[PDB]
Design an enzyme around this catalytic site. Sequence first.
Site, PDB file in Angstrom:
ATOM      1  N   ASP A 107       0.819  -1.221   0.000  1.00 57.57           N
ATOM      2  CA  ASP A 107       0.000   0.000   0.000  1.00 57.57           C
ATOM      3  C   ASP A 107       0.855   1.275   0.000  1.00 57.57           C
ATOM      4  OD1 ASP A 107      -1.797   2.049   0.179  1.00 57.57           O
ATOM      5  OD2 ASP A 107      -2.826   1.298   1.962  1.00 57.57           O
ATOM      6  N   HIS A 157       1.465   8.096   3.842  1.00 65.37           N
ATOM      7  CA  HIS A 157       1.986   7.336   4.963  1.00 65.37           C
ATOM      8  C   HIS A 157       3.494   7.482   5.085  1.00 65.37           C
ATOM      9  CE1 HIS A 157      -1.933   5.614   5.750  1.00 65.37           C
ATOM     10  NE2 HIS A 157      -2.020   5.188   4.501  1.00 65.37           N
ATOM     11  N   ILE A 171       0.824   9.499   8.537  1.00 69.33           N
ATOM     12  CA  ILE A 171       0.107   8.615   9.457  1.00 69.33           C
ATOM     13  C   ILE A 171       0.336   7.136   9.131  1.00 69.33           C
ATOM     14  CG2 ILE A 171      -1.662  10.332  10.016  1.00 69.33           C
ATOM     15  CD1 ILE A 171      -3.490   9.001   7.887  1.00 69.33           C
ATOM     16  N   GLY A 207      -4.158   2.459   8.443  1.00 66.74           N
ATOM     17  CA  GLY A 207      -5.187   1.883   9.316  1.00 66.74           C
ATOM     18  C   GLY A 207      -5.113   0.359   9.402  1.00 66.74           C
TER      19      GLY A 207
END
Lengths: 532, 532
Positions: free
Chosen positions: A436, A441, A456, A459
């Site tokens: 991903d 990120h 971040i 998730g």
Amino acid sequence: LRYDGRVAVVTGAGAGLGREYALLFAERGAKVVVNAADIVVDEIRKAGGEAVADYNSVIDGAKVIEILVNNAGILRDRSLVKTSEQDWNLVNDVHLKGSFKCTQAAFPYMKKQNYGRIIMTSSNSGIYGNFGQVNYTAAKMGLIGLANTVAIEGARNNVLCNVIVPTEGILPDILFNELKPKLIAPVVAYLCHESCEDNGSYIESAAGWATKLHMVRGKGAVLRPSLDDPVTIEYVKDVWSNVTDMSKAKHLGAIAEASGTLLEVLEKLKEGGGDAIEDAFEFNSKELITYALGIGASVKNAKDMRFLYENDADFAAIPTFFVLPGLLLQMSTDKILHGEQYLEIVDDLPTSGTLLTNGKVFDVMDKGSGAVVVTNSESFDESGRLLVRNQSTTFIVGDPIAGVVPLQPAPNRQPDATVQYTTSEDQAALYRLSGDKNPLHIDPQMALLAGFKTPILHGLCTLGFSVRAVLAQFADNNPALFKAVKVRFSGPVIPGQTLRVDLWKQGTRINFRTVVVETGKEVISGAYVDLK
Amino acid sequence: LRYDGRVAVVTGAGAGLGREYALLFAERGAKVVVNAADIVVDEIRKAGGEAVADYNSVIDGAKVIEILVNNAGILRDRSLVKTSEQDWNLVNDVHLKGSFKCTQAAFPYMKKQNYGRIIMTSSNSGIYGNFGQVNYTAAKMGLIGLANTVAIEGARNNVLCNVIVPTEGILPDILFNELKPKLIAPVVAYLCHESCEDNGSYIESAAGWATKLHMVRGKGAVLRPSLDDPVTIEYVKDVWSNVTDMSKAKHLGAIAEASGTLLEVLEKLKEGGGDAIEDAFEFNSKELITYALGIGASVKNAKDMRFLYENDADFAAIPTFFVLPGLLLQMSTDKILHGEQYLEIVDDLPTSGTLLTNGKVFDVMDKGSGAVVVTNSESFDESGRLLVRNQSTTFIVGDPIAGVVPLQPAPNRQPDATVQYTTSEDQAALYRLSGDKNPLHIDPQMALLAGFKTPILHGLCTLGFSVRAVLAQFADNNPALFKAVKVRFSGPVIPGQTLRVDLWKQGTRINFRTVVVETGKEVISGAYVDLK
């Protein structure tokens, strides 16, 4: 390695390739028929061997017969418009028709004996084409189709048929001096020995080097949106880059294979349609371990070795690994905040293979200043066993239907257990390697443009940490006990931050929530794991 | 998408595939010749189109001619021993000879016009073989070799030639009812349109689905130990699994390609011999970043982003990444304590590709209770540019020659700089993902059997950390300034331990040593990096 008690027939054995097939066969014990011929017979005999001469034309193979290497040939190289009746005819007669006649006359003797070795001579000229040679290239590729059927009709009685492919201006001495017939003979000899189980092979050889050729077939492409539409020329064009995409090409073994895959296409198209997406996902232990480290598994934990070392007796995927095939397919094209995730293991999980996955929009909702798209995905192994259900919910700025997996709120009481995991500052830099690649990120500038102050953590990475807490705490780190996970992603985690997973045990179901310790904020909500 | 100002000729247009090629061509503007025929002409006309009838046999293509889709055919399916003169002849005449004659007569008109589209009809029966069909499979594969040359002789004047491959008991209705000629016609139509630049293609199609077929060729195998040895049948056997290994198979475009690779083989064999090893190494950004994280690069360091995110403007390998191709090849077979390493970058480094590497034992020594083997390795890119020299020294329990790269002792004075790096407990579990799977870096039981109390970090991992200290400290983290590294591995590091790299600057050369802080012990000695 000898040929005692064997009779071999070589056409065009007067010279070149044929001649040397003759000598080597006799050299190693076989009694030979040299189909010009007398010079080779006397030379085989004087070298200490048994052989007879033959003056027959290959058109008349019955008299030749009374191992078979078809090697006789002629050349009549003309342009296309300048290739006459005699030009076409004589090349097609000696190469193609001649090989047929001779194999025809020899087969009965080979089949009733339950032993047989046949060879056809093709060429790269046939395989690739070559200017000014239509007659020859038509003939030599014809010999491949001849052999393909001779192979099959001889298979069950040990009558095998293979194809040998012997590869201006001035060549360099090293090449010219190695392009000799003596160096190709032993490949042919091996293909004509008792120990050889090759049938229907194309073997290319020259200069003391050899390889195998075979035909491969692309994945291809459906040429209509549904079974209820015709095929238009405009669709064939729009879809042509997929038709001719050879990046997933495979070799089929037999015509029935080629025929049996059409059904699958039609059934797929029928069950759903052109509003569906499909992709392949290859993996082995490397990807499994890359993923487990990405979600915090560590060799500091004895129970984690099984997720981190491929030769461990209990080596397995952490089962949330199987969100990836669904995920990558669904984010590969658009036909985006990841808001909720569901994952169901339906059957025993493998540790490698090549997965097939599909993608279908299941439900669309309207939430005022945004739309919710629920996407459903199924992953199957190579033989066709369903391994994974993936349901993912996305929000696109800017009443759910049955079959949309609902969230379950936390049991209103103190958690039964808690687990703390520190993430590293490189947690996302590592996790993104599992596929991903979203720049938010890792890249500060892109994170900002997506409305985050710093990069971040994914998730799904946080979900990974959470399912790990569930499995160590409630399943003895046994991945085979994992049935399903459901999650709302409810806030951002920054790599380097500390997670606590709150767990409640309620029979089969482990409710959980995940909190960043330093802020006090909830980041996984309405969530559970089903165990077996 | 139309065919205005175009004349198309379809053979066997009376029925089936031909018939529907006729209708669609006329449907979309082309004026058509239907080569039974009258029924199709009147039906094209009534549907509102222009077309003429033709009663000629394909053997007599000159009268037919006065776009070309060769589709006429016959069937005479017999076993091999039961296929007669008329059986062979009539099938070969209509399919193969007939297509030749008709393409022959049409080409001049297409070439002098600088526009042409030709189609041959082959079949899977030809491509794969099928019991009881020698005549037909010989003929239909013959059409592939015909087309391969027609394609080439027409290429420079926009005269293109492609191959269409139209795919008991009871079929399922869904399959039987989709196996219709109307669904294949538009593939043929697209292959015969002005926008199409496909030449020499094999296109398979049925049921509204299509793919492309092509021939691929294995890497293959040399059939002698050297140029000074003959080829024996025994060697062909011993080496047959390599000859027929299709795992690295590639498609060639033209006969000259097939011919030009032999030279390389001969030259390789000559420069060295059969006592040499060869292997392929594929990589992209994924492997680069996996490696950089394995040697401690971290997004906490602004200067490390370039090694950790593929879309960074300065994205590059940490250059010690290029020890891997040499390493993996040399440890893949035996023809073992890693004691010393040398690595030379010779040219600008890429961020992906498929490398070719070789392996040759350079020197053997005798150190009483042990033997030293010096191994030399060279890595080249796809086009043939030399990228890397790898010299590795191993000790096998139980006077160096020129060209063995010597160690250089530390300058006798205080280091100019020091860098401290903490390793993580998972450092080896992560580093081994770059390809070095030796169980002693992860499995306690195997570490012990190899004489270590705990799993130890890979020596090359520690070298990675050290070159990173060199590059941040002395090259502004610019990997393009790295020339070479040389190292003695002088002791074990345990993941989780802390390293200090001592550095001395002396012009081009950075001498260094690496110490585990907690024990005080030296683990990299006699070592240096050459900068540019």
